[PDB]
């Protein structure tokens, strides 16, 4: 709970009246994509 | 587009949202750098 | 009384004109703003 | 006469690391600097008001 988060931040079981900066929020990624050049030619490794 | 995703273009991997851009890239130009030298505008290998 | 009132009004007008026409009159506040902005820009630049 | 300066704030992990995540995992073992910075900047911000 945010109250529990504040308690953990202050390292005490009671917090006085006021405003406290606890942590930061950031939205997580939803999916993943990948893009590469459209090549389908194998490299000449057997010939080497 | 318009979704928080973790992408990788030609081995350059990063997390963010990809949007349509109106920057006038030169035909030879590929990347785009900000003040902090972190990639900001990219050209995908396919569909150019 | 009238002479002093006239002098006071003329002085106020001259103060307005002098503040309008002097570029270095307000240097201190601009210096504060410039200091803060330059420090922040230096911080964001050192990341590269 | 200047009176107050601009109240600023910083995010520790966003600047020190990048968009990656195990970088923060490495960061967790370097100490508790973030508390010091947050406390000092909060003090400055309240001093401005
Ligand atoms: C391969 O990629 C190119 C460039 O994006 C595209 O023009 C072409 O249609 C693609 N071919 C196939 C079979 O997907």
The finding on whether B46 has its CB within 6 A of some atom of ligand 1 is yes
Assess contact for D37 and D13: CB atoms under 8 A. Answer: no
Q: Token pair of B42, please?
A: 């990219």
A44 to each of A11, A36, A48, C13, how far by Cα in Å? 63, 20, 7, 87
- C-alpha of residue C39 to centroid of ligand 1, in Å: 48
B15 contacts A29 by C-beta, under 8 angstroms: yes
Experimental method: cryo-EM
Asked whether at least 3 C-beta pairs link A and C within 8 Å, the reply is no
Q: Under an 8 A CB cutoff, do D11 and A24 touch? A: yes
**Separation between Cα atoms, residue D1 and residue B38, nearest integer Å:** 40
Beta-strand pair B32-33/B39-41? antiparallel
Name chain A contacts of B3, Cβ cutoff 8 Å.
Answer: 30-31
Name the residue of chain B whose CA is nearest to C45's CA.
B36
Dihedral sign of CA atoms B11, B14, B15, B17 in order? negative
Strands B5-9 and A31-32 come out as parallel
Q: For chain A, list residues whose CB is within 8 angstroms of any CB belonging to chain D.
A: 21, 24
Contacts of the segment C30-35: beta carbons below 8 A, 24+ positions apart: C32/D2, C32/D5, C33/D6
Phi, psi (deg, nearest 5) at residue B22 = -115, 15
Task: Give strand pairing partners of A35.
Answer: B9
Pocket lining: B45 vs ligand 1, CB cutoff 6 Å: no
Cα(B20) to ligand 1 centroid in Å equals 20
> What sign results for the dihedral spanned by CA atoms C18, C23, C27, C29?
positive
């Amino acid at each position: 709970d945010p109250l529990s988060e504040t308690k953990c931040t202050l390292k005490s079981f009671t917090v006085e009246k006021g405003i406290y900066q606890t942590s930061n929020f950031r939205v997580q990624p939803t999916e993943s994509i990948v893009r590469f050049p459209n090549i389908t030619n194998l490299c000449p490794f057997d010939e080497v | 587009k318009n979704k928080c995703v973790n992408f990788n273009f030609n081995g350059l991997k990063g997390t963010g949202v990809l949007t349509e851009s109106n920057k006038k890239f030169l035909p030879f130009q590929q990347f785009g750098r900000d003040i902090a030298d972190t990639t900001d505008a990219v050209r995908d290998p396919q569909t150019l | 009384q009238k002479l002093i009132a006239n002098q006071f009004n003329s002085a106020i007008g001259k103060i307005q004109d002098s503040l309008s026409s002097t570029p270095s009159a307000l240097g201190k506040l601009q210096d504060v703003v410039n200091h803060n902005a330059q420090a922040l820009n230096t911080l964001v630049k050192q990341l590269s | 006469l200047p009176v107050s300066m601009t109240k600023t704030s910083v995010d520790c992990t966003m600047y020190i690391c990048g968009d990656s995540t195990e970088c923060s995992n490495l960061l967790l073992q370097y100490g508790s600097f973030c508390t010091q910075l947050k406390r000092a900047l909060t003090g400055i911000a309240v001093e401005q008001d």
